[PDB]
C-alpha cells in the first residue's frame with residue numbers, strides 16, 4: 001500500500017525558494033526504500049517554476065503578493081495529485097503543513113503579513129473531498145498507524 005508525499009518532505013528542491021523541507025524520519029526512509037512513497041509537488045506539476053514567488057489563498061483563489069492569480073496551476077496540480085492516487089490505489093497523503101497547496105491544519109491568511117490561520121491547501125482540500133486522508137509532517141505516528149492498519 002503506497003502514499004503520496006509532498007516532494008519537498010523527501011528533500012527535493014521544489015520549494016518556492018529552491019530549498020527543501022527534507023524531514024528526518026527512519027519510517028519515511030524505509031517506506032521510500034520499499035517504493036511506497038510517491039514524491040509529488042502540486043505546484044511544479046501544475047506548471048509553476050522553481051523558484052516562484054510566494055502565494056496565499058484568498059478563498060478559492062491563490063494569488064501572489066503582486067496580485068498575479070495562480071489558481072489555474074494550483075487546481076491543475078491538485079487534480080493531478082488526485083489522478084495519481086486514483087491510478088495507484090492510494091488513500092493516504094503526507095503533505096507539507098502551512099502550504100497553500102499541501103497545508104492540512106494551517107495556511108497563511110491571504111493578507112501577506114506572516115499570519116497563519118486554521119485551514120487547508122487546495123491539494124489537501126481536493127484529496128480529502130475524495131476520501132483520501134491527509135496527514136502533515138507533525139502527524140507521522142498517526143499516518144504510520146493508519147497505513148499499518150490497512
Ligand code: SF4
Nearest residue numbers: 006008015041096102
Ligand atoms: S507545493 Fe507542496 S510539495 Fe511542492 S514544494 Fe510546495 S509544499 Fe512542497
